Design a binder for this molecule. Structure first.
Ligand SMILES: [Mg+2]
Ligand SMILES: [Mg+2]
Ligand SMILES: [Mg+2]
Ligand SMILES: [Mg+2]
Ligand SMILES: [Mg+2]
Lengths: 138, 99, 208, 150, 125, 83
RNA sequence: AUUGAAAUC
RNA sequence: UAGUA
RNA sequence: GAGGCAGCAGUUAGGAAUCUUCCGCAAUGGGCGCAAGCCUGACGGAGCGACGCCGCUUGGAGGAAGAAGCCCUUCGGGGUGUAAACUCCUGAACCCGGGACGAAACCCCCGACGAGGGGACUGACGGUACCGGGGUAAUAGCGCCGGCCAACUCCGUGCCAGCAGCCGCGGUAAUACGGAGGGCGCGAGCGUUACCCGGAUUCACUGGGCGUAAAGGGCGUGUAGGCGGCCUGGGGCGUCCCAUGUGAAAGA
């Protein structure tokens, strides 16, 4: 049926970015929109925007890459190196402010859903809340 | 505080008494997943007032019997023959689990 | 109890002159002058590329053999320094350097750590008046490590206190020469000693 | 110039018509101990040309090691084949705590404070190669600022 | 396995078993000798290797090995056993301890004197 | 009956007591209801005796007989001294 | 005796 | 036939 | 008929193995007594075990281009080795002298049977600790040296005798066996056997896998169970946050 929408998305982005595509549709939800803002705000993507495709709501996603590169294999470095579900339908992961992960001594995100709303780790830490630990990007 | 549990009546086939199934969910001590677990409690019903499919609160009490230690505090909602049915199959399932 | 046996003999084997025999291991021989090589039938034989273990070992032997202390005692001191706040190798050199039997020798009341030990056991040395006969005693900073008034007379105390009339003393120490007493001002920094031993190989020796 | 250490030398063997026929494999690292190391695995009829050959290759094969006071920016894991290396930053006083192979690469890069585990197949060649990829792949606040900027 | 599976079945603990029933753990056990055969080994080896069968205070009857140069053991000898495989002798999982009971030390033994059980000598000593 | 009294801590030839309240029937070094001081009979320290005296008064107030030597020490820090 | 042996004289 | 590259 | 040490000692038996039929109620605690006191193998001590942890001794400084002996030797030499000898120095042990804290209460006297003041009795450890005086060069062993793992040579022995944690050493030139010399490691210890966690991400939550390496059920149907698309609203069980209670002492 489509068991995890959030993961599907996290993956559509993993997959597209690895053949250096410019854009990617994902079928649209509010919670999906949210994660994308944090993604955009921390400059892992250029951004997103709604659309309609065959009568139906998608969110186009504008990926972003490094500069073309030197020697044999000139493929760019990649702005999103690592994106990964953590809470999952078959095993939900919840953490309190005291146990929030510090992805990659600082250089990394951990998107994280709380009662104050969807938030990065430092956001959440400073707001002092924890929650369902959605995923991590670096 | 005297514990208050809420469940469903799954038997009133006993005089002044009801079997009340009570579920409960939690993180698993090692493996994360939220699991469910459930328990019948025999709760006292002096006015044989509650019946099949009532969802009821349940309270810690001074012992009424061997294994009655709770009293039906109040009705939460009537109906719920689904939950009762859900139970009752799981019970009749055990019939072709033997040798 | 402690080593006891042939010595300027690892003023050999460890490859570098250890100061162990004091006035002679200074004057055409810590035999290292006459024989700069390992002891025994195979001493001057073609050297063998040695293991990253053999290397690490030797180094800790070296350090331990300088101060004359045992492996049991040494190993503990080290353990104590890992659990202690701060960069660990230095600290250990610190604690190692704060042992009476060695401060006494750093002040030149004796010419040898071996000799300086015997002065501590045998009574002749004090810590702020009170007499102290444990070579292992942790001199802290502000202490006064004196000679025994009843021991000043001794030929050996005099002869040795005498050669210190001119001589200079460690930056973390001082020395009133005619009052036959000195002072542990602070614990030394790695920089302050010039020890023939890379300390980080010691840490590494005890990480397996 | 650099300082150059030999990790490993091995003798291999092809089989030929009556008799076996040896050959020698050499793993060498070179470093200035200030965030430039290189690895070379060179092979030949006799050991010294293997070693010498290794040396040459190792200098053709150098890396950006972004030190941060005797340690590294962050943690990496790398799987190279069924060889996994895990690398962790440590405070001063810690040391280089690894097995021969990554120690000698890390020491000569100019690291003094790191935590590691050799995981999976511990084959030295493949472990060595993994450590390098691991190094080759570290970043710093500067680089990720730059990347995420646009 | 899926987490649900792990929640249903768990992982199973690994329990490896004793390489040596000298029963009750016991670091040693008392024997009375029974037979003092001589055994030929295996694999790529040959030599006549000294052995005893031993009735144990465990109720066990087992083949143990007499180490050292020569020995003084026979049908009623009475030995201590420490366990220690041989390797060349399949089914030989224990050793006789030289120097306790009617097992002799080892005469004229100068090097590994502590094993083999032989007191310090008095030559130029 | 509940007691204020001395429990032996320290080591051998190093007595050190803790002035404790406890049920009389408990062993000496067993579970006490409340610490209320300590005491070093060799006075090897400048501070060889100490007593939380507001607390001592509390228990006395709810009936707790002290050992005889518990009460000596209690006195030294004037538990019973008035006005 | 033959190769270190087993076999064999 | 056994040990042995 | 009598009896019941899984109280303290101690005897026996099983067992690889586990102590004195000890001193004292002086201290703390307990019971009865108004008190003096009586009882307490609780306890406080001593005795035996290197059984564990910590401290310390068996010397210190001089001392040959280097004794003797013993080991190597391409017969020149090399090693043990500043090690001994021997020169001065200090003075563990041992002898003499003095000598504790642990104990101030209860009790008695003043006061009032209170508060406060005064006073006396009491030490099993013990003539011990500690202080002063005198004063003798005065114990070293165990494991290891093929690789992993730190340390090599000569004899002996010939798939024998034997070693061996694992790979494996021994068939007349053995750094792997046995002895020598020498060397390495620990040192009043050093080895061995057993058992536990480790390394073992080798039950993998952190942290594993299944085409051919161990591993996809012979296929469906579907019961329970696990899991569940987009939007809005109510509840607040899961989840998060703040206060507060609990979390004994010992341990870390
Ligand atoms: Mg064979
Ligand atoms: Mg041996
Ligand atoms: Mg494990
Ligand atoms: Mg199939
Ligand atoms: Mg189906």
């Amino acid at each position: 049926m489509l068991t995890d929408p959030i993961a599907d998305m996290l993956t559509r982005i993993r997959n597209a970015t690895r053949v250096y595509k410019e854009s990617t549709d994902v079928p649209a939800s509010r919670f999906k929109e949210e994660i994308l803002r944090i993604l955009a705000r921390e400059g892992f993507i250029k951004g997103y925007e709604r659309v309609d495709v065959d009568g139906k709501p998608y969110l186009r996603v504008y990926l972003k890459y490094g500069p073309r590169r030197q020697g044999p294999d000139p493929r760019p470095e990649q702005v999103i190196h690592h994106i990964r579900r953590i809470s999952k339908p078959g095993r939900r992961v919840y953490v309190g402010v005291k146990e929030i992960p510090r992805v990659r001594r600082g250089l990394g995100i951990a998107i994280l859903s709380t009662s104050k709303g969807v938030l990065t780790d430092r956001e959440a830490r400073k707001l002092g809340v924890g929650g369902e630990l959605i995923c991590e990007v670096w | 505080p005297k514990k208050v549990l809420t469940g469903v009546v799954v038997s009133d086939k006993m005089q002044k008494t009801v079997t009340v199934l009570v579920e409960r969910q939690f993180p698993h001590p090692l493996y994360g997943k939220v699991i469910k677990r459930s328990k019948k409690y025999l709760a006292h019903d002096p006015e044989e007032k509650y019946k099949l499919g009532d969802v009821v609160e349940i309270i810690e009490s001074r012992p009424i019997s061997k294994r009655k230690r709770f009293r039906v505090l109040r009705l939460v909602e009537s109906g719920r023959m689904d939950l009762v049915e859900k139970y009752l199959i799981r019970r009749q399932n055990y019939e072709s689990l033997s040798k | 109890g402690r080593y006891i046996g042939p010595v300027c003999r690892l003023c050999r084997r460890e490859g570098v002159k250890l100061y162990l025999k004091g006035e002679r291991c200074y004057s055409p021989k810590c035999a290292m002058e006459r024989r700069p090589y390992p002891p025994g039938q195979h001493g001057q034989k073609r050297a063998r590329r040695p293991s990253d273990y053999a290397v690490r070992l030797r180094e800790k032997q070296k350090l331990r053999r300088i101060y004359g202390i045992s492996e049991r005692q040494f190993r503990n001191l080290f353990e104590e320094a890992s659990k202690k706040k701060g960069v660990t190798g230095s600290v250990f050199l610190g604690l190692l350097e704060s042992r009476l039997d060695n401060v006494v020798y750093r002040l030149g009341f004796a010419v040898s750590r071996r000799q300086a030990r015997q002065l501590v056991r045998h009574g002749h040395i004090t810590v702020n008046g009170r007499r102290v006969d444990l070579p292992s005693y942790r001199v802290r900073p502000g202490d006064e490590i004196a000679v025994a008034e009843k021991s000043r007379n001794l030929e050996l105390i005099r002869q040795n206190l005498e050669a210190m009339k001119g001589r200079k003393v460690g930056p973390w120490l001082s020395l009133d020469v005619e009052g036959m007493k000195g002072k542990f001002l602070r614990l030394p920094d790695r920089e302050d000693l010039a020890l023939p031993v890379n300390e980080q190989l010691v840490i590494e020796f005890y990480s397996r | 110039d650099f300082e150059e250490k030999m990790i490993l030398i091995r003798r291999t063997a092809r089989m030929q018509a009556g008799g076996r026929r040896f050959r020698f494999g050499a793993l060498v690292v070179v470093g200035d101990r200030q965030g430039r190391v290189g690895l070379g695995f060179g092979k030949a009829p006799e050991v010294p040309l293997a070693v010498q050959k290794a040396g040459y290759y190792a200098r053709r094969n150098m890396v950006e090691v972004p030190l941060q006071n005797g340690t590294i920016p962050h943690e990496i894991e790398v799987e190279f084949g069924a060889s996994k290396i895990v690398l962790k930053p440590a405070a001063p006083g810690t040391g280089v705590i690894a097995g021969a192979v990554p120690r000698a690469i890390l020491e000569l890069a100019g690291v003094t404070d790191i935590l590691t585990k050799e995981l999976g197949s511990r084959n030295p060649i493949n472990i060595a190669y993994a450590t390098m990829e691991a190094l080759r792949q570290l970043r710093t606040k500067a680089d990720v600022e730059r990347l995420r900027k646009g | 396995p899926t987490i649900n599976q792990l929640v249903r079945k768990g992982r199973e603990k690994v329990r490896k078993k004793s390489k040596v029933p000298a029963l009750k753990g016991a670091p040693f056990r008392r024997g009375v000798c029974t037979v003092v055969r001589t055994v030929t080994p295996k694999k790529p080896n040959s030599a006549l290797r000294k052995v005893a069968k031993v009735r144990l205070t465990s109720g066990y009857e087992v083949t143990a090995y007499i180490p050292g140069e020569g020995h003084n053991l026979q049908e009623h000898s009475v030995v201590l056993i420490r366990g220690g495989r041989v390797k060349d002798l399949p089914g030989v999982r224990y050793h006789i301890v030289r120097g306790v009971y009617d097992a002799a030390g080892v005469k004229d033994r100068k090097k590994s004197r502590s094993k083999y059980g032989t007191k310090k000598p008095k030559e130029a000593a | 009956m509940v007691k204020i009294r001395l429990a032996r801590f320290g080591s051998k030839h190093n007595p050190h007591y803790r002035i404790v309240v406890t049920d009389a029937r408990r062993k000496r070094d067993g579970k006490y209801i409340e610490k209320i001081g300590y005491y070093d009979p060799r006075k090897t320290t400048p501070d060889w005796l100490k007593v939380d005296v507001e607390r001592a008064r509390y228990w006395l107030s709810v009936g707790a007989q002290p050992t005889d030597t518990a009460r000596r020490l209690l006195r030294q820090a004037g538990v019973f001294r008035q006005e």
